[PDB]
Structure 1
Amino acid sequence: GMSQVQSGILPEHCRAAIWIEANLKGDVNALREASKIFVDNVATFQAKFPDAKLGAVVAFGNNVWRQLSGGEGADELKDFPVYGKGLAPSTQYDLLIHILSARHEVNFSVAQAALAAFGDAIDVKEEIHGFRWVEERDLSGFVDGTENPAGEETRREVAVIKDGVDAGGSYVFVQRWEHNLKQLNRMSVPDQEMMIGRTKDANEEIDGDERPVTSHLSRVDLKEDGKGLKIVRQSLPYGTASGTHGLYFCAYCARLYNIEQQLLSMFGDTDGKRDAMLRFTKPVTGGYYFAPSLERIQALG
């Protein structure tokens, strides 16, 4: 009589992922059997490819989750709002599928399985292939992940709802960024470091009172009476060298509150200042989703 977390929230250092964002085209009922088929497929792929260390998550937007849940629980869930009066655009969809593992080829098979399960019930809006880059750096050349919650125990504490109807579930935030690396390369390395809040090559934290309040770390390293507002990030670089490229931002949290506070901070709603990264990169999508526990995906019918 307990709850199991979906397999894709907690894994650390996976080298590849696929994110599919889609709208519900018909009766929301179609999502019931599809979701059950999908998590069964994941179990099948985990059995066939034990060395892939595969995990996946199926999550739902506010409108369809209120229908599937009958309005019970997920009290913080809402459509992703526009932040900074539009600085952060809003592209709220109905369904999010997140696949991650040590093997892109296995991820690809799982994505095909997801598409076959949901079939013509969904309208795919975005499919992004994330890849870990050299030294786990973002395409900007700064290491991404250093202060991310480490270890299953702490990641569970931060990402997984502990009790009540939603025990084992999590809130998910996805936001695709498009980097302008030409604009970045116009900046001196010291200017870039003051924009992030860490040194570039050695990845050393710059002290809070040495770095601008607009620095990324100053915007998102938030505390409430000394307790950090932590989140579990699963973000990865994506794109082509000659085309669109950037960071696919993805975070999980037991409370949507921690994510929203960081967004209000970055986009100027809190103190009128905004994240210095907007000098070379911008968000073009945005959505909030609820990732139920595995057994509730099994109580979908």
Structure 2
Amino acid sequence: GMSQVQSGILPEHCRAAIWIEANLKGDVNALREASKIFVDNVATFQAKFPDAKLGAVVAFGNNVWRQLSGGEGADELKDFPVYGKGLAPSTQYDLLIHILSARHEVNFSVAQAALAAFGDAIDVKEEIHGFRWVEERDLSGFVDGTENPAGEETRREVAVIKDGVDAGGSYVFVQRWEHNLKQLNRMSVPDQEMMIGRTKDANEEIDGDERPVTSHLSRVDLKEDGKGLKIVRQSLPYGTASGTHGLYFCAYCARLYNIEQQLLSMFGDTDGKRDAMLRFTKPVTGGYYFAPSLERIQALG
């Protein structure tokens, strides 16, 4: 008489992921059977590829989740708003599929299964293939993940709703960034470090009173009476070397509040200052989704 978290929220150090963002084309009913088939497929792939350490998440946007849940729970869920009067654009869709594992080839089979399950009920808007880069660095050359919640216990505390109707569920935020590495390269390494808030090569934190308030760490390392507003990031680099490339940002949190506070900070809504990373990269998509517990996907009918 308890809830099980979907398999894709908690895994750490996965080398590869696939994110699919889509709109509902017909009657929302279509999503009930599809979602059950999809989590069943995931169980099948986990049985066939035990060494892939595969996980997946199916999450819903505000409008369709409100219909599927009958308005019960997910109290913080809302369409992704524009932040910074447009600095952060909004591309709220109806369905998010997040697949992550040690094997891209398995992720790809799982993605085809997802598409077969939902079929023509969805309009695919974005399909991004994430890959861990050398030393777990973002394409900018800075390590991404150092202060991310570590271990199943702490990641559950941060990401998974603890009781009531939503127990086992989580709020998800996705935002695709397009890096301009030419612009980044014009910056001296010390200027880059002051932009991030950590040294580039050795990845040492720069003290808060040494770095500008516009540094990334000064914008997102937030505390409320000493209590950090933590989130579980699953972001990964993506793209081609000669084409579009950047970071596919993805975060999970028991409370949408922690994510929103960091976005208001980054995009200038809190103190009128904005994140220094906007000097070389920009966000081009944005959405908020609710990841129900596995058993709630099983009580969809």
Distance in 2 between the 1:82 and 1:200 partners? Answer: 31
User: Scaled by the length of structure 2, what TM-score is found?
Assistant: 1.00
Q: Deviations over 1:132-164 (max 9, x none)?
A: 000000000000000000000000000000000
User: Scaled by the length of structure 1, what TM-score is found?
Assistant: 1.00
Distance in 2 between the 1:180 and 1:160 partners? Answer: 35
- 1:238 positional shift: 0.0
Question: Partner of 1:42: helix, strand, or coil?
Answer: helix
Distance in 2 between the 1:246 and 1:14 partners? Answer: 18
- 1:200 positional shift: 0.0
- 1:78 positional shift: 0.0
Question: Partner of 2:263: helix, strand, or coil?
Answer: helix
1:156 aligns with 2:160: no
Q: Deviations over 1:239-281 (max 9, x none)?
A: 0000000000000000000000000000000000000000000
Distance in 1 between the 2:242 and 2:82 partners? Answer: 30
Q: How does 1:129-168 map to 2 (within 5 A)?
A: 129-168=129-168
- 1:287 positional shift: 0.0
- 1:175 positional shift: 0.0
Q: Percent identity?
A: 100
Distance in 2 between the 1:34 and 1:68 partners? Answer: 13
Distance in 2 between the 1:127 and 1:8 partners? Answer: 17
Any stretches of 5+ residues in structure 1 without a counterpart? none
Q: Deviations over 1:2-50 (max 9, x none)?
A: 0000000000000000000000000000000000000000000000000
Q: Deviations over 1:171-215 (max 9, x none)?
A: 000000000000000000000000000000000000000000000
Distance in 2 between the 1:142 and 1:68 partners? Answer: 41
Question: Partner of 1:140: helix, strand, or coil?
Answer: coil
Correspondence for 1:258: 258
- 1:65 positional shift: 0.1
Distance in 1 between the 2:269 and 2:133 partners? Answer: 32
Superposed CA RMSD in Å reads: 0.1
Correspondence for 2:125: 125
- 1:286 positional shift: 0.0
Distance in 2 between the 1:164 and 1:289 partners? Answer: 19
Question: Partner of 2:213: helix, strand, or coil?
Answer: coil
Aligned length: 301
Question: Partner of 2:3: helix, strand, or coil?
Answer: coil
Q: Deviations over 1:77-119 (max 9, x none)?
A: 0000000000000000000000000000000000000000000
Correspondence for 2:109: 109
Distance in 2 between the 1:3 and 1:208 partners? Answer: 40
Distance in 2 between the 1:89 and 1:231 partners? Answer: 21
Question: Partner of 2:199: helix, strand, or coil?
Answer: coil
Question: Partner of 2:177: helix, strand, or coil?
Answer: strand
Distance in 2 between the 1:211 and 1:52 partners? Answer: 41
Question: Partner of 1:23: helix, strand, or coil?
Answer: strand
Question: Partner of 2:251: helix, strand, or coil?
Answer: strand
Q: Deviations over 1:215-246 (max 9, x none)?
A: 00000000000000000000000000000000
Distance in 2 between the 1:73 and 1:5 partners? Answer: 16
Question: Partner of 1:150: helix, strand, or coil?
Answer: coil
Q: How does 1:91-106 map to 2 (within 5 A)?
A: 91-106=91-106
Distance in 1 between the 2:293 and 2:185 partners? Answer: 44
Distance in 2 between the 1:50 and 1:227 partners? Answer: 38
